[PDB]
Structure 1
Amino acid sequence: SAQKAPKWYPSEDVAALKKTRKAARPQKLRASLVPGTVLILLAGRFRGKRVVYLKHLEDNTLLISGPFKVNGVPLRRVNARYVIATSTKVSVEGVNVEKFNVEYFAKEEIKAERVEDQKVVDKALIAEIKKTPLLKQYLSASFSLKNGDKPHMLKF
C-alpha cells in the first residue's frame, strides 16, 4: 500500500436541517410610494426615465408604466429601492391594473396581449396626465443630475 488507510471513516449520511424559524412577513413600502406617483428610475435599461407607479406586486416589485407612448417605457417591474419617489401624483383610480401579477411576467416578438394591455392602461393614464399641463412633457424627459445638484438636499 502507498498509504495506510484511516482507522475511522466519516458517515456519508447528510443530516437534516434544524427546523429554522424565519417567517416570510409582508414588506410595507415607504410611505412615499403610493400608486399614481411619478418615479425617477435610478438604474437599469430605463435609467433616468420618469415613470408612473401602478401596483405593488407580490414579489415586492413595483408595477409601472411609462406611459409607453409618452417615453417608451412599457408596463414593467422595477425594484422599490432603485427608484426616487417624487412628490407628484396622478390619480390611478380609473386604471384596472388588477389583471397584473408575477405570473404575468413568466419569462419562459411581443405577446399581442401585452401590446394590448399596454394600450388600455396608457389610455387611462394619459386621460389623467393631460389634466395637469406640462406633466406629459415632464414624463417625456429623462432626469439627470446637473452640476450643483445635491441629492441629499433636493426635494423631488
Structure 2
Amino acid sequence: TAQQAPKWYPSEDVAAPKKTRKAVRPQKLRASLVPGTVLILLAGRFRGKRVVYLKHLEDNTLLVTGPFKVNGVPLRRVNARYVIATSTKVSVEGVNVEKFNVEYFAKEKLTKKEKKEANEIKTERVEDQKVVDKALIAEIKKTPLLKQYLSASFSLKNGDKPHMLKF
C-alpha cells in the first residue's frame, strides 16, 4: 500500500438544514412609480426610450408598453430599479390589463442540442398589443406634444447634471 489508511472515514450522508426564518413579504414600490406614469428605460434594447407604465407584476417587475405604434416598444416587463419615473402622468383608467401575469411571458426554454449555427412571433401577443394600444393611443392625443415626446428618445446632453435635474 502506498497509503496505509485513515482510521475514521467521515460519514458521507448529508445532514438536513435548519429551519430558516426568512418570510417573503410583498415588495413596496417607491411612490414615483404609479400606473400610467411615463418611464425612461436605462438598460436593454430600448434604453433611452420613454415608455408608459401600466401594471406591477407578481415577480417584482413592471408591465410596460411603448405604445408599440408610437415608439416600437412592445408589451414587456422591466425591473423597477432599471427605469426612471418621470413626472409626466397620464391616465390608464379603462385599459384591460388583468390578463397579463408572470406566466404570460414564457420563454419556452430550448434544449442545448438545438445549437444556433447561423440563425416567429406569436399570434396572440400582437392581438393583445393593439387592444391595449387602442385604449391608450386615443387617450395620448388629449394632451398636446405627448406622442412626439413618447416617440422621441431620451439622452444626456453636455452640461446636464442628473443629481440636479428633475426627471
Deviation at 1:109, TM superposition (A): 15
- Give the TM-score taking structure 2 as reference length: 0.91
Q: Distance in 2 between matches of 1:132 and 1:112?
A: 32
Shift in alpha-carbon separation, 1:71–1:109, aligned structure 2, 3 A = farther
Partner SS state of residue 19, structure 2: coil
Q: Distance in 1 between matches of 2:164 and 2:5?
A: 70
Give unpaired runs (5+ residues) of structure 1: none
Give identity over the alignment, percent. Answer: 94
Partner SS state of residue 81, structure 2: coil
Shift in alpha-carbon separation, 1:109–1:74, aligned structure 2, 3 A = farther
Partner SS state of residue 153, structure 1: coil
Q: Distance in 2 between matches of 1:46 and 1:12?
A: 51
How many residue pairs match? The answer is: 156
Paired residues for 1:81-96 under 5 Å: 81-96=81-96
Q: Distance in 1 between matches of 2:131 and 2:165?
A: 35
- Give the TM-score taking structure 1 as reference length: 0.97
Alpha-carbon RMSD: 1.8
Deviation at 1:3, TM superposition (A): 0.7
Give unpaired runs (5+ residues) of structure 2: 111-121
Deviation at 1:4, TM superposition (A): 1.2
Deviation at 1:45, TM superposition (A): 1.1
Q: Distance in 2 between matches of 1:143 and 1:30?
A: 22
String of CA shifts for 1:5-46, please: whole Å, max 9, x gaps: 100110101011101010010001000000000000011111
